[PDB]
């Protein structure tokens, strides 16, 4: 199985506990269909050199494995799930893929694509093609456009379609169609894989209020932190709060919503502020005058907790969550020029994945932030990720923890 | 000297003769000042990872040197020239640099920068900082903005500021100020270096009609080919024709002007059509319905030859220059999808540098084009240049031939 023997379900109650199991996706053929005219639509800053991007991704996975982490590749998880699923589920996956296609499928193309999918020889090939997009060339048909079904090029950013939340999961209604389509795989594995089937959901795509995993943080057993960003709205955090209170087994007690600049290229809270050790946070100064906070009381706030403004400065707000003096590390370090802060913030300099408290993985390119982290006593495991970085995410964006060991607070 | 023993002046009478000496520039500190908000202004598609871009450039230079080519780095050529120049010339280089600064310098900043440049201890440091740009930090002053003098980030594209044309040169009035500033160095080396001082100029920056080197091609001893592009105007080619007829030592007989798509990111003729062997040419089909041609008669067209429409299709037009049937190789090869042609054309897939007939150097990333060239009998010497490619130029754009061996047609 893609899961090691100790994996006994979703268990993510911090951003920093020793990482046990994690979900990633090496970009497949879907990034080969990114064209110059569609960069804004497809959510890329520039076109990736595909072979090199895959080589970088393998280095990232190799570093995670060198740290005894169980790395689950999305394609393999979906295929494994497909293989053991009922025929009813196998069939509905293909039907829902067709109904949710972009561009919308004509009746004739729906039949042609269905047959093509059904004829794929292995479940892995079926999953690869559904992620890749489908051309008229793949189908052997004449058409006036080359892409009969668009790629889901952002799939390598597994942070975003769903988020592990304690021992439950939130499966999201994403902002843009190009990414909403990725949640088909999320619903499928959680609804059918024996090791995930019993996981309770606190959000699902049908709710239609925008939220993405890059905005979701599990600071400790009591407090969740969710961004109010270009991708997640405050009203959506309000619905999340309602769902959590409605779930009697869910033990979180508070949600702090954090406002960030609504930049299309720094679209989630994790591109502005992350927690990397028990008391260390990495942030971009560019957000200094935009940060704003709201608290939700999941215990004594009623069945529908409302967001209450918290006027403390960022440091005091963070202190109210961990009850220790926080250490705030700025992008590019003390003394950096505005140009250096803008450049390293642009390349997702805050977006490190913590694999144990104070030990993080992220791109080698943000050298001043790497040095700032090391000076603050955080160990940095860099990897070359220049091509992957053009998709506007770093290691945190490219991962979704499935299980972490308890933190000794 | 940066020039090897045999160099005896500009000698470029073809696009393909065995390359003997060539001018390049490894991107210096100037590319560290490219910020997200200024990408369009500075002419970049995305920000480069500077360290990796310099390593890629060293690999390009290593490939050139392995083919017995004298590679001249612009910084070293300017410093060598400065060390041999009259005090009047050394002083005027500084004054013209200040006069042409962007942003325009206040009188106070003009004095502070002049003093700072005069205090540099070596000519190479002086040249490096003029290219890099100058910050308030470099000067140790307080200022409203961090850049007191902007970088010239595009300097590594040495194809553009001036072009070798037979045994003369065209020093250009470029389209945008961010690049016009680079011509300061072109004028300096040709006006002062003993090995370049007798080179006749057929164009100079004071002429104020736009033309850039990526548009200039020397097909053979008789025919020049100049693009009408986003950067070079037909009226400028007309002025160039007038200048060549006035120069009684210049032996070219004809200029063919080739209209190309006016795309901001494919801005020169050499991003649409190049000549790589005696009868082989590489082109992007995206330009098919845009190519249009004009001829200038430099022999019997009077003192001011005018552009005369040439209605031949591309194949016939090229045949009228080389006097035999051309082989036209399309970007990405026969059978490529439109997505592939769009992607490889975008990454300057036509922009190869020929180092001898039918032997070219270009980025490894355009794999389908590299395969099409090899299938057409052209040897490709690829190098990894993904970061350099984000500047929207390939190997031809990163080089300016100074001398080539005669071609045996």
GROMACS .gro file of C-alpha atoms in nm, chain A residues 29 31-36 45-52 135 137 146-147 337-340 342-343 346-347 364-365 367 384 386-387 390, chain B residues 29 31-36 45-52 135 137 146-147 337-340 342-343 346-347 364-365 367 384 386-387 390:
model
   68
   29UNK     CA    1   0.179   1.572  -1.829
   31UNK     CA    2   0.212   2.102  -1.689
   32UNK     CA    3   0.305   2.031  -2.055
   33UNK     CA    4  -0.020   2.197  -2.162
   34UNK     CA    5   0.050   2.536  -2.004
   35UNK     CA    6   0.070   2.784  -2.293
   36UNK     CA    7   0.185   3.147  -2.298
   45UNK     CA    8   0.378   3.303  -1.332
   46UNK     CA    9   0.571   3.151  -1.623
   47UNK     CA   10   0.590   2.824  -1.812
   48UNK     CA   11   0.789   2.547  -1.638
   49UNK     CA   12   1.063   2.336  -1.799
   50UNK     CA   13   0.880   2.012  -1.729
   51UNK     CA   14   1.167   1.761  -1.713
   52UNK     CA   15   1.360   1.983  -1.476
  135UNK     CA   16  -0.619   1.619  -2.641
  137UNK     CA   17  -0.468   1.370  -3.055
  146UNK     CA   18  -0.662   2.076  -2.917
  147UNK     CA   19  -0.768   2.030  -2.556
  337UNK     CA   20   1.659   4.589   0.131
  338UNK     CA   21   1.300   4.636   0.014
  339UNK     CA   22   1.413   4.479  -0.319
  340UNK     CA   23   1.536   4.167  -0.136
  342UNK     CA   24   1.003   4.185  -0.245
  343UNK     CA   25   1.202   3.922  -0.435
  346UNK     CA   26   0.758   3.679  -0.438
  347UNK     CA   27   0.920   3.336  -0.446
  364UNK     CA   28   1.739   2.695  -0.205
  365UNK     CA   29   1.676   3.012  -0.403
  367UNK     CA   30   1.913   3.250   0.030
  384UNK     CA   31   1.671   2.317  -0.589
  386UNK     CA   32   1.346   2.696  -0.945
  387UNK     CA   33   1.107   2.549  -1.200
  390UNK     CA   34   0.721   2.944  -1.111
  438UNK     CA   35   2.461   4.243  -1.003
  440UNK     CA   36   1.989   4.125  -1.246
  441UNK     CA   37   1.967   4.122  -0.863
  442UNK     CA   38   1.766   4.445  -0.884
  443UNK     CA   39   1.484   4.309  -1.098
  444UNK     CA   40   1.169   4.333  -0.876
  445UNK     CA   41   0.822   4.186  -0.933
  454UNK     CA   42   0.915   3.753  -1.828
  455UNK     CA   43   0.999   3.655  -1.471
  456UNK     CA   44   1.271   3.712  -1.213
  457UNK     CA   45   1.589   3.507  -1.257
  458UNK     CA   46   1.760   3.302  -0.987
  459UNK     CA   47   2.084   3.497  -1.021
  460UNK     CA   48   2.335   3.244  -0.902
  461UNK     CA   49   2.199   2.971  -1.132
  544UNK     CA   50   2.167   5.203  -0.455
  546UNK     CA   51   2.313   5.182   0.033
  555UNK     CA   52   1.650   5.257  -0.305
  556UNK     CA   53   1.783   5.283  -0.661
  746UNK     CA   54   0.088   2.040  -3.180
  747UNK     CA   55   0.004   2.408  -3.166
  748UNK     CA   56   0.069   2.403  -2.789
  749UNK     CA   57   0.423   2.273  -2.858
  751UNK     CA   58   0.356   2.811  -2.896
  752UNK     CA   59   0.572   2.690  -2.606
  755UNK     CA   60   0.792   3.147  -2.666
  756UNK     CA   61   1.125   3.025  -2.534
  773UNK     CA   62   1.836   2.243  -2.399
  774UNK     CA   63   1.479   2.318  -2.305
  776UNK     CA   64   1.369   1.963  -2.705
  793UNK     CA   65   2.104   2.426  -1.972
  795UNK     CA   66   1.640   2.794  -1.803
  796UNK     CA   67   1.704   3.100  -1.587
  799UNK     CA   68   1.334   3.408  -1.859
   0.00000   0.00000   0.00000
